[PDB]
Design a protein around this ligand. Sequence first.
Ligand code: ANP
Ligand code: ANP
Ligand code: ANP
Ligand code: ANP
Ligand code: MG
Ligand code: MG
Ligand code: MG
Ligand code: MG
Lengths: 288, 287, 288, 288, 287, 288
Amino acid sequence: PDGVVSALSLRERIREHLSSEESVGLLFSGCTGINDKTLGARGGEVIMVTSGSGMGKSTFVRQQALQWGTAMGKKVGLAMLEESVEETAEDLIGLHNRVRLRQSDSLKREIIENGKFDQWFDELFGNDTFHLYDSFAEAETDRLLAKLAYMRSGLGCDVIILDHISIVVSASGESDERKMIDNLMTKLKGFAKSTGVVLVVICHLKNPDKGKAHEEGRPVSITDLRGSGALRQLSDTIIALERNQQGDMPNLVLVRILKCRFTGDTGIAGYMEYNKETGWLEPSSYSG
Amino acid sequence: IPDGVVSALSLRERIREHLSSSVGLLFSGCTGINDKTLGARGGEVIMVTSGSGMGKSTFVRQQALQWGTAMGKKVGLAMLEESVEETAEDLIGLHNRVRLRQSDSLKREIIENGKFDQWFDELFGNDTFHLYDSFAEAETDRLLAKLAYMRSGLGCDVIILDHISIVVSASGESDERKMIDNLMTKLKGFAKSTGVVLVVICHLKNPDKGKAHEEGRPVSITDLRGSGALRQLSDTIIALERNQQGDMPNLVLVRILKCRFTGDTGIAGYMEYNKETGWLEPSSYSG
Amino acid sequence: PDGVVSALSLRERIREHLSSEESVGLLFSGCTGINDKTLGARGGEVIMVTSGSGMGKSTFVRQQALQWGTAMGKKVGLAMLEESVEETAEDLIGLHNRVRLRQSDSLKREIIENGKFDQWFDELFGNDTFHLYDSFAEAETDRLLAKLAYMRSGLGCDVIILDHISIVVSASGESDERKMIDNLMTKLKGFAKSTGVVLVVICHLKNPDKGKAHEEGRPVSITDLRGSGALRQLSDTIIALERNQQGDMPNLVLVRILKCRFTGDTGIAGYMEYNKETGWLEPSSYSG
Amino acid sequence: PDGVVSALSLRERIREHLSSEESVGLLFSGCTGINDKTLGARGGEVIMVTSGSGMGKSTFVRQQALQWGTAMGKKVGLAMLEESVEETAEDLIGLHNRVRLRQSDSLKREIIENGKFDQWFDELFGNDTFHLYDSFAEAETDRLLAKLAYMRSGLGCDVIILDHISIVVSASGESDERKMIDNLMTKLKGFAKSTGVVLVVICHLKNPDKGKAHEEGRPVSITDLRGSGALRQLSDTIIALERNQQGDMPNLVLVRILKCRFTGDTGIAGYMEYNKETGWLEPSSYSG
Amino acid sequence: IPDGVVSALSLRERIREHLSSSVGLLFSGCTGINDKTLGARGGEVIMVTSGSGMGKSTFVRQQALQWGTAMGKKVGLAMLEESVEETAEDLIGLHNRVRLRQSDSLKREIIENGKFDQWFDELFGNDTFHLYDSFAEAETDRLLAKLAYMRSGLGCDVIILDHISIVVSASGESDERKMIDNLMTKLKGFAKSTGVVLVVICHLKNPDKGKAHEEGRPVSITDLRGSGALRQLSDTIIALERNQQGDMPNLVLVRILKCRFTGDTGIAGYMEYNKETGWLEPSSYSG
Amino acid sequence: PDGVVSALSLRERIREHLSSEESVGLLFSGCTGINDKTLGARGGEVIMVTSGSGMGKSTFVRQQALQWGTAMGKKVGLAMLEESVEETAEDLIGLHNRVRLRQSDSLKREIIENGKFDQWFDELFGNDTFHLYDSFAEAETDRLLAKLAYMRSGLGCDVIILDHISIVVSASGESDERKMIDNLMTKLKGFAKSTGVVLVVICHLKNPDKGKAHEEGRPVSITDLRGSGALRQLSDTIIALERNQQGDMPNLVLVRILKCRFTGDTGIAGYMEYNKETGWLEPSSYSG
Ligand SMILES: Nc1ncnc2c1ncn2[C@@H]1O[C@H](COP(=O)(O)OP(=O)(O)NP(=O)(O)O)[C@@H](O)[C@H]1O
Ligand SMILES: Nc1ncnc2c1ncn2[C@@H]1O[C@H](COP(=O)(O)OP(=O)(O)NP(=O)(O)O)[C@@H](O)[C@H]1O
Ligand SMILES: Nc1ncnc2c1ncn2[C@@H]1O[C@H](COP(=O)(O)OP(=O)(O)NP(=O)(O)O)[C@@H](O)[C@H]1O
Ligand SMILES: Nc1ncnc2c1ncn2[C@@H]1O[C@H](COP(=O)(O)OP(=O)(O)NP(=O)(O)O)[C@@H](O)[C@H]1O
Ligand SMILES: [Mg+2]
Ligand SMILES: [Mg+2]
Ligand SMILES: [Mg+2]
Ligand SMILES: [Mg+2]
């Protein structure tokens, strides 16, 4: 039974490896430092981003999809399960154009009439780099995976953003969905590793209800992550955002690398500030 | 061969339609709900929920009363779990700052001293309130038509459907988890077309994994009963929390779990229930 | 399709409602406060009574039976599945004459030979307000209900006490009796709501075995109720009895309203003390 | 479906009940007070006795079997699973005769030669009141129950002492023996209730390993009991002994009534002192 | 018809036999074990156990060495998990206060400077030690005969059977839980008849329900591996406990779980393992 | 039946034993102390290495491979089931030349074009001491073992590293893979003990999710080891790596000997620090 290769006979294979074997790919936008401790997002890697409900996850991720899909011309696949395509389409446009397009009826009215809409649409979806999952109607694990599968190998997406991994909708008849979040994870990491696609997954936090928490600051710990630490093991990197909406600097958010397989370099990456005007998470200078 | 994954480039018209079609009907009981939501829009679907017996119906009723009184709007009430007379009693009582139900003396009183009629007209005078009537299990389409009649027939501005778990429809298809989802689409659809403000109530899953709801514990979008089809079709989501086994049982924390329009979520503010007047008064608090 | 009424057109129906519509009914004996928070027990309602093991449940419930069956003269149907009718019959007599008949061989021998037994027997059971299920030989759900329903409809009972709802004894061949308790609740609630009878039910608590517990004080919580929270919903009022048997005042008991649908007024009702001499649950003046 | 009896029609049944319905039976020996709070051991009752390993359980119980089987001529059934018949036979003899017969080769030698053995044997096993389970070899639940069953209904024992309910030995192939201790319990209480036999069961304590414990004093709490509180609910009374072998008065032991269904009277019963000479647990006067 | 329940009256003779047939062989390493047990009696069956790798074999070996040296007794050693040479090494080393095994230098030393032979005779001179030999799975009866030969053939006073889980016998009967029980009866029986002191070692069940053994945690009679047939047939039961992840890893608590003879149980006392000499020295301690 | 030897008659066998009997062997690199407590790794022994997720297991183990394969020139068989041979090949090269080759696209491109790649490749893999299992395509137990055995017996490896023992992939159709891990252990231990090879195996930890954990410091305990304590017995030495990635010194790691059969010397071995520049686990001077 021989499948036992001696290191000597791997010379070429290894050489072929070192050349065009990327260790730095897809850098995050909005806070160098995330990049310092992670060296970006490698293909085949599963990237986890979390935070207190409504503190940065969504915006942050949505911004990465934007930069990757624009300035760096990558094919971005979007799977925003809790919202409609036009809705997320709307967010991107406003965001790209640094305007709270949704939070303003006046503006939506304007651009549609003065014609700026069409301008903005082509200026963003012009190079056909964005592709989304359409439905809203509960997607099943394999059902979903099949579609992400299509996005990767079919439309050739470089990145897939799955927003919210609690919306499972699968094989109902097996206690505690904990097993679900885990099996799903396994299928995601497996899907990622083999296709080589960068996979950014969002998940929520357990409600600590034992101290003072999240919405009020309080660092998020690897244990806090929803779903029984199956993702704490299946995901290669873990970005967490922390901020105190009920404090002094509600828009000051701290980025913490809870985990990073590739580099092993963990800890506080840096900070960012939410600009209510532009609706962006701008880079910041701070230290507490 | 493909299957349901659209490209952004092909969303042009769809996005355009979406973009076209600011502040209407501000809730009562706690400013801030408005701060974070700017009130309720026609066509929009409001979702109010909380633990069992924490004030879901109460909150919704207070809204009905202010909207159908102060802001002269035609309200449609569909409380599938209580007699019309019952809901009427609550409205009549609330309107007069008294817990008519918790008082057999007061009820007797107002009926004998003649005040009932006074109160009854002083409230139901302008003909702004209308209700569904039964307690005898209502079917989806059955109910919807009726809600549709209230909007088109009687011309209501708001429609309150208390409790969206009382489905009662096409039985034979497993896990009513889809019922809740299908109905919600029919509800969201109906709301959007007619442009009526729709406030709906749904229960929460029993976490039974920690210390829960009736004992504080913030509610999260995941907790919502019914397989999150509603955390979707519904535009705004309010959540009422309180710790009845605590020091301030009447103190309730309002939490905006979702506001499609303003996207502004989090804690709206605090309110206290007035055991006397039975009103949800805005409170002064911070934890 | 028209079944939509207008508030105005309901004037008479509402008028009819506001009078002879009972909101207050059958006050609990033992502590004013249970009444302040619950306004008593309404027909068609399901009262759930619980506590630690051997802490007072049955006695609390049996007191409500004696006072309702006597002073407020109502037909009480008793279904004490863990005790013989003559035994429950025995407690009622003792209680009615303020003596712990059972804890005394001398008093029993007495009342039997001095002829006081017949006196008390008449002076109590006379008005034929008491009726009981009979067996000890495991009863089935429908079997039981049928009997209950007979008490309500056949004999015309205003109140039905069902001591202990974990003694199911039914359609064995379906995993975890967790579903049994839940399906039983639904039937009880339904039964109660439709017939209009006052339904007082007792149930056990989950053994916390994760801290210090119940018999040693420790407030019970809705989560503690045995049976997967089917009853924490179907039942209208939940009365929890607490006390610390290994403390300075073992007989001192805290009454907690875990839930009151009607009033929504929850929390600590007040305290009671057990009179080891009369066996009565007397109200108490106390504060911790 | 009528099995619904009205209290009025139970007059005779009830009368027949009150007379020759014992509430005080089999009082404990060695510490009045246990009797004050429990009124003894009623037939059909399941009595639980526990303590730190080697602190009183065995001796205490062994003494009750002795008094009940002697001075009060009751038929005592013994099931000492961790020891041989001759061995427990030996203990009783020595104990009855207030001498550490086992802890003394000199004495065993004497009585056998000087003939006092035969004297002591007849003076104790004379009235044929003692019957034991024989084996040592792991007994199975139903296997055991069958034999206890025999002791009760066959030899007509008034009391059965089952020493140690952790030695289960039954239906191996079902996770966590926790279910075992519980099912067994259920079968014991069921066996007890129906035959009317007094059942004294011994069980050990969970090792707290979170504080300072048992062998060093520390009151035993109902939660501490081995086996998932199935016995905390199935047993009618619970006697616990506490003492500090590593303290000042190692032989001073406190008796605590952790539970008592019949009376509801819980708390510290009283104390006793171990006399290394007589090997008995003598009554004491103390207060800490 | 009856079944195995005897009455006290019929135990007369049996009790008599039992009553007929004080201090022999006192353990080494911690007085108190003796205080609570008065040593080991012939015919008696001693049971030593503890967590995995906490010093079961070590303790037993120290006993073998003191008994076969200081108290000139013939010891039979049956360490089914180690070569004769290995156990011999331990004895030789212990006898000279050195951890021969943890030293490749010392081993080399004593062999070259000639000390090995000196030590070897100085110890195995009086011909008091004898061992089983293999590592090749031994069968119950197979092993017993051999133990029987050591007692009758070579005339040993003590017999050490290290590890009673290495059964290796009549395979085909489920749960080796009975094997352990049957063997134990054969062992207890053999001990009682011949009157040889038998020290046996058995493992513990892995509690995996709390914080366990290697981390402190007193061991209880229930923990004993093998369905408590041994907590029965064995007359005395010693238990060694220590917290290797603590401050005093070498500090071990000896606990008498059972002493049929004295009935005196509980904590015997404390000992410390001498990383240098490799001896279990009595310690001064109290918690 | 005679197979009973006398100590005396063994003199020569013992003499032969005491010399050329190796007790010290293959010292671990990274921290003296692992060696003080374990005396290195003996052939025929099973070394178990573990820690939190992405905390250093693989790296620790891979260092032992490089030093044993080089400096102490032994045949090392690598079975990294979660990484490509060229990838493990890549880490060994980088490590050997004290550079984090993988975390640098610039260094890779360099060594490839300046010809240093071939130099390093030879200067390392030259002596043919390194050999690896090859796939990523799930390996079966026997399948794997067979391969392992080939490395030991066929190629003559002194050490066999098997990274990760939760990747089972075998006879699916039998509940909880808890039995799989245990049966696998037995085979490994057996394999090791019989062939005499040094077997270093890695395994995961159970997610404590009951306090603050592992990645955040928190000493691991034998109970934490994943896989039902089959390995906590079959394996000879258990090395646990601890560190707090969200602290002041993330790269500082505490080495804990969870168990050492040979020496019985357990506890904290000492500390190590990860050199982010050379990627080497260097010893550290520290004390908490
Ligand atoms: N003590 C340390 N401090 C900081 N980085 C480290 C440390 N030890 C290793 N690393 C680096 O962290 C990364 C992951 O380490 P590695 O040992 O490969 O992970 P692992 O624990 O095997 N992963 P997993 O299989 O996911 O648990 C590598 O780049 C290592 O070089
Ligand atoms: N925040 C509050 N504090 C105290 N009492 C309240 C509060 N809100 C409502 N109540 C009262 O509690 C009772 C039940 O409230 P209601 O909103 O009718 O229940 P619900 O949640 O609709 N019930 P259910 O359908 O059983 O969940 C009524 O008497 C209310 O007036
Ligand atoms: N607060 C109290 N303090 C002291 N004794 C009490 C108290 N309440 C009841 N008792 C007595 O305690 C005994 C047991 O009470 P009872 O309510 O019958 O038990 P229970 O809780 O129904 N038992 P179980 O079904 O085993 O939980 C009776 O003799 C009661 O009279
Ligand atoms: N109390 C102790 N403290 C520290 N080391 C000890 C102690 N007792 C024994 N040791 C040493 O620990 C190692 C293993 O002891 P040993 O008694 O041989 O293991 P064991 O328990 O028989 N092993 P196993 O069969 O695997 O359970 C030897 O080097 C002993 O000298
Ligand atoms: Mg309601
Ligand atoms: Mg009861
Ligand atoms: Mg050993
Ligand atoms: Mg690894």
